[PDB]
Short mmCIF file of all heavy atoms in Angstrom, two decimals:
data_model
loop_
_atom_site.label_atom_id
_atom_site.label_comp_id
_atom_site.label_asym_id
_atom_site.label_seq_id
_atom_site.Cartn_x
_atom_site.Cartn_y
_atom_site.Cartn_z
N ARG A 1 0.82 -1.21 0.00
CA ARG A 1 0.00 0.00 0.00
C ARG A 1 0.88 1.30 0.00
O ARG A 1 1.75 1.51 0.84
CB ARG A 1 -0.94 -0.13 1.17
CG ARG A 1 -2.17 0.85 1.23
CD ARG A 1 -3.29 0.46 2.18
NE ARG A 1 -4.47 1.35 2.03
CZ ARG A 1 -5.47 1.18 1.16
NH1 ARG A 1 -5.64 0.08 0.40
NH2 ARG A 1 -6.50 2.01 1.20
N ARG A 2 0.66 2.16 -1.00
CA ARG A 2 1.33 3.44 -1.09
C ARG A 2 0.39 4.52 -1.47
O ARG A 2 -0.75 4.27 -1.89
CB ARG A 2 2.59 3.41 -2.06
CG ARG A 2 3.75 2.66 -1.44
CD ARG A 2 4.20 3.28 -0.16
NE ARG A 2 5.39 2.53 0.40
CZ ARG A 2 5.33 1.55 1.33
NH1 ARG A 2 4.16 1.17 1.89
NH2 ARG A 2 6.49 1.04 1.77
N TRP A 3 0.85 5.79 -1.23
CA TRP A 3 -0.05 6.98 -1.46
C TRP A 3 0.40 7.57 -2.80
O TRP A 3 1.56 8.01 -3.00
CB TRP A 3 -0.02 7.96 -0.26
CG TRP A 3 -0.71 9.26 -0.49
CD1 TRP A 3 -0.35 10.33 -1.32
CD2 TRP A 3 -1.97 9.61 0.08
NE1 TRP A 3 -1.23 11.46 -1.15
CE2 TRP A 3 -2.20 11.03 -0.21
CE3 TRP A 3 -2.78 8.92 0.91
CZ2 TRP A 3 -3.36 11.66 0.28
CZ3 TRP A 3 -4.03 9.52 1.33
CH2 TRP A 3 -4.30 10.85 1.03
N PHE A 4 -0.55 7.60 -3.73
CA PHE A 4 -0.43 8.03 -5.16
C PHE A 4 -1.13 9.32 -5.48
O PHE A 4 -2.27 9.53 -5.07
CB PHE A 4 -1.05 6.95 -6.08
CG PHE A 4 -0.22 5.73 -6.21
CD1 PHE A 4 -0.49 4.75 -5.15
CD2 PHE A 4 0.60 5.56 -7.32
CE1 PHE A 4 0.12 3.51 -5.28
CE2 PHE A 4 1.29 4.27 -7.32
CZ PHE A 4 1.05 3.32 -6.38
N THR A 5 -0.41 10.15 -6.30
CA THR A 5 -0.91 11.43 -6.80
C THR A 5 -1.01 11.51 -8.33
O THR A 5 -0.05 11.24 -8.93
CB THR A 5 0.02 12.50 -6.24
OG1 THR A 5 -0.03 12.64 -4.79
CG2 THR A 5 -0.32 13.94 -6.71
N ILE A 6 -2.17 11.98 -8.88
CA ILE A 6 -2.30 12.33 -10.30
C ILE A 6 -2.18 13.86 -10.34
O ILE A 6 -3.02 14.56 -9.64
CB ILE A 6 -3.67 11.96 -10.80
CG1 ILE A 6 -4.14 10.55 -10.26
CG2 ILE A 6 -3.77 12.27 -12.32
CD1 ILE A 6 -5.54 10.28 -10.76
N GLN A 7 -1.21 14.41 -11.03
CA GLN A 7 -1.01 15.83 -11.25
C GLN A 7 -0.21 16.12 -12.53
O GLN A 7 0.74 15.35 -12.85
CB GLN A 7 -0.27 16.49 -10.10
CG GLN A 7 1.09 15.81 -9.73
CD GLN A 7 1.86 16.58 -8.68
OE1 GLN A 7 1.88 16.21 -7.51
NE2 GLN A 7 2.55 17.66 -9.09
N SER A 8 -0.51 17.21 -13.25
CA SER A 8 0.15 17.58 -14.52
C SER A 8 0.50 16.54 -15.51
O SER A 8 1.58 16.43 -16.10
CB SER A 8 1.12 18.81 -14.52
OG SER A 8 0.60 19.80 -13.64
N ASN A 9 -0.56 15.69 -15.79
CA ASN A 9 -0.46 14.58 -16.75
C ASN A 9 0.60 13.58 -16.44
O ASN A 9 1.26 13.09 -17.36
CB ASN A 9 -0.31 15.04 -18.23
CG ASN A 9 -1.34 16.15 -18.46
OD1 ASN A 9 -2.51 15.93 -18.09
ND2 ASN A 9 -0.87 17.23 -19.13
N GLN A 10 0.69 13.27 -15.13
CA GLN A 10 1.71 12.39 -14.54
C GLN A 10 1.01 11.63 -13.39
O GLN A 10 0.08 12.13 -12.76
CB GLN A 10 3.00 13.17 -14.28
CG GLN A 10 4.20 12.35 -13.79
CD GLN A 10 5.46 13.12 -13.83
OE1 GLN A 10 5.92 13.56 -12.74
NE2 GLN A 10 6.09 13.13 -15.01
N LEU A 11 1.55 10.45 -13.08
CA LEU A 11 1.20 9.65 -11.86
C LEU A 11 2.47 9.41 -11.07
O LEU A 11 3.38 8.67 -11.60
CB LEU A 11 0.56 8.30 -12.08
CG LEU A 11 0.03 7.57 -10.82
CD1 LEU A 11 -1.37 7.90 -10.45
CD2 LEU A 11 -0.05 6.06 -11.10
N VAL A 12 2.58 9.94 -9.80
CA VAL A 12 3.75 9.69 -8.91
C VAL A 12 3.32 8.95 -7.66
O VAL A 12 2.16 8.93 -7.32
CB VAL A 12 4.28 11.06 -8.61
CG1 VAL A 12 4.67 11.89 -9.84
CG2 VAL A 12 3.57 11.93 -7.61
N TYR A 13 4.25 8.35 -6.93
CA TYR A 13 3.99 7.69 -5.69
C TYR A 13 4.99 8.23 -4.67
O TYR A 13 6.20 8.49 -4.79
CB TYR A 13 3.88 6.12 -5.90
CG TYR A 13 5.18 5.40 -5.55
CD1 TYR A 13 5.30 4.95 -4.18
CD2 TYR A 13 6.23 5.19 -6.45
CE1 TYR A 13 6.44 4.37 -3.75
CE2 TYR A 13 7.36 4.41 -5.98
CZ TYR A 13 7.52 4.13 -4.66
OH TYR A 13 8.63 3.40 -4.17
N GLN A 14 4.43 8.27 -3.34
CA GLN A 14 5.16 8.92 -2.34
C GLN A 14 5.84 7.81 -1.59
O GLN A 14 5.29 6.73 -1.35
CB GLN A 14 4.15 9.69 -1.42
CG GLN A 14 4.71 10.36 -0.19
CD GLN A 14 3.64 11.38 0.36
OE1 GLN A 14 3.66 12.61 0.19
NE2 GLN A 14 2.76 10.81 1.25
N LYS A 15 7.09 8.03 -1.24
CA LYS A 15 7.94 6.99 -0.68
C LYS A 15 8.20 7.18 0.83
O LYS A 15 8.37 6.15 1.52
CB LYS A 15 9.26 6.83 -1.58
CG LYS A 15 10.40 7.80 -1.44
CD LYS A 15 11.29 7.80 -2.63
CE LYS A 15 12.59 8.64 -2.50
NZ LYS A 15 12.44 10.10 -2.20
N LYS A 16 8.15 8.37 1.36
CA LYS A 16 7.97 8.74 2.70
C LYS A 16 7.27 10.15 2.79
O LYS A 16 7.35 10.90 1.85
CB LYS A 16 9.38 8.62 3.41
CG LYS A 16 9.47 9.09 4.82
CD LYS A 16 10.94 9.07 5.42
CE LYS A 16 11.10 9.70 6.82
NZ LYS A 16 12.52 9.59 7.23
N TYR A 17 6.67 10.46 3.95
CA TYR A 17 6.09 11.78 4.17
C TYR A 17 7.20 12.82 4.26
O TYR A 17 8.20 12.68 4.95
CB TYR A 17 5.24 11.73 5.41
CG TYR A 17 4.44 12.96 5.69
CD1 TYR A 17 3.49 13.42 4.79
CD2 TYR A 17 4.63 13.75 6.84
CE1 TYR A 17 2.67 14.57 4.99
CE2 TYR A 17 3.88 14.92 7.04
CZ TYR A 17 2.93 15.32 6.13
OH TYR A 17 2.26 16.54 6.21
N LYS A 18 7.01 13.98 3.54
CA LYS A 18 8.07 15.00 3.48
C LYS A 18 9.39 14.52 2.90
O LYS A 18 10.44 14.69 3.54
CB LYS A 18 8.37 15.72 4.81
CG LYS A 18 7.07 16.36 5.33
CD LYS A 18 6.48 17.42 4.40
CE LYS A 18 5.24 18.06 5.01
NZ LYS A 18 4.82 19.22 4.17
N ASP A 19 9.39 13.82 1.74
CA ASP A 19 10.63 13.42 1.12
C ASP A 19 10.39 13.38 -0.40
O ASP A 19 9.21 13.11 -0.65
CB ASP A 19 10.73 11.89 1.67
CG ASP A 19 11.97 11.06 1.26
OD1 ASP A 19 13.05 11.36 1.79
OD2 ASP A 19 11.92 10.23 0.30
N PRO A 20 11.23 13.63 -1.40
CA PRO A 20 10.94 13.57 -2.83
C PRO A 20 10.10 12.32 -3.30
O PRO A 20 10.13 11.25 -2.69
CB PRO A 20 12.40 13.41 -3.35
CG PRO A 20 13.19 14.30 -2.41
CD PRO A 20 12.57 14.16 -1.02
N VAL A 21 9.23 12.46 -4.37
CA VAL A 21 8.33 11.46 -4.86
C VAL A 21 9.10 10.65 -5.92
O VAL A 21 10.12 11.13 -6.41
CB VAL A 21 7.10 11.99 -5.46
CG1 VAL A 21 6.21 12.61 -4.39
CG2 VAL A 21 7.32 12.97 -6.66
N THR A 22 8.55 9.45 -6.36
CA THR A 22 9.07 8.67 -7.51
C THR A 22 7.91 8.58 -8.54
O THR A 22 6.73 8.46 -8.13
CB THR A 22 9.60 7.31 -7.02
OG1 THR A 22 10.69 7.51 -6.14
CG2 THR A 22 10.05 6.42 -8.19
N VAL A 23 8.21 8.78 -9.86
CA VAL A 23 7.32 8.65 -11.02
C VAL A 23 6.86 7.13 -11.25
O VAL A 23 7.67 6.23 -10.99
CB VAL A 23 7.77 9.32 -12.36
CG1 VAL A 23 6.81 9.08 -13.53
CG2 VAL A 23 8.06 10.76 -12.03
N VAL A 24 5.54 6.85 -11.55
CA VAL A 24 5.05 5.55 -11.78
C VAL A 24 4.79 5.40 -13.30
O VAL A 24 5.21 4.35 -13.86
CB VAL A 24 3.71 5.34 -11.06
CG1 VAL A 24 3.19 3.99 -11.35
CG2 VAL A 24 4.02 5.46 -9.59
N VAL A 25 4.23 6.43 -13.90
CA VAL A 25 4.13 6.40 -15.38
C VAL A 25 4.60 7.74 -15.83
O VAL A 25 4.19 8.72 -15.20
CB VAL A 25 2.71 6.06 -15.98
CG1 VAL A 25 2.38 4.64 -15.67
CG2 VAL A 25 1.58 6.92 -15.43
N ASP A 26 5.49 7.87 -16.81
CA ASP A 26 6.08 9.11 -17.29
C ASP A 26 5.07 10.17 -17.80
O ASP A 26 5.16 11.35 -17.57
CB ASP A 26 6.91 8.78 -18.56
CG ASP A 26 8.35 8.21 -18.25
OD1 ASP A 26 8.68 8.08 -17.04
OD2 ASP A 26 9.08 7.83 -19.21
N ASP A 27 4.13 9.70 -18.60
CA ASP A 27 2.96 10.47 -19.10
C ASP A 27 1.61 9.72 -19.09
O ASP A 27 1.65 8.46 -19.23
CB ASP A 27 3.25 10.90 -20.54
CG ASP A 27 2.62 12.28 -20.94
OD1 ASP A 27 1.41 12.38 -21.02
OD2 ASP A 27 3.41 13.22 -21.19
N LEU A 28 0.42 10.47 -18.90
CA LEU A 28 -0.89 9.86 -18.87
C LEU A 28 -1.62 9.96 -20.16
O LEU A 28 -2.47 9.11 -20.45
CB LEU A 28 -1.78 10.23 -17.68
CG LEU A 28 -1.17 10.06 -16.29
CD1 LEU A 28 -2.13 10.87 -15.35
CD2 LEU A 28 -1.26 8.57 -15.90
#
């Protein structure tokens, strides 16, 4: 289980709270 964001034609996943995100799909 991870926390995912859709923003600016991108899907990222958060790897810790308050730390840089990682990309899941480059473009939507």
Side-chain angles (χ1 to χ4, degrees):
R1 195 164 187 87
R2 287 300 182 265
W3 171 291
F4 286 87
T5 295
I6 318 178
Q7 54 174 103
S8 323
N9 314 312
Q10 186 168 104
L11 188 88
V12 303
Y13 99 91
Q14 174 164 259
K15 79 200 187 302
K16 174 185 173 180
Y17 187 61
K18 304 298 183 172
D19 182 72
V21 291
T22 297
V23 177
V24 178
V25 292
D26 278 0
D27 213 292
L28 308 165

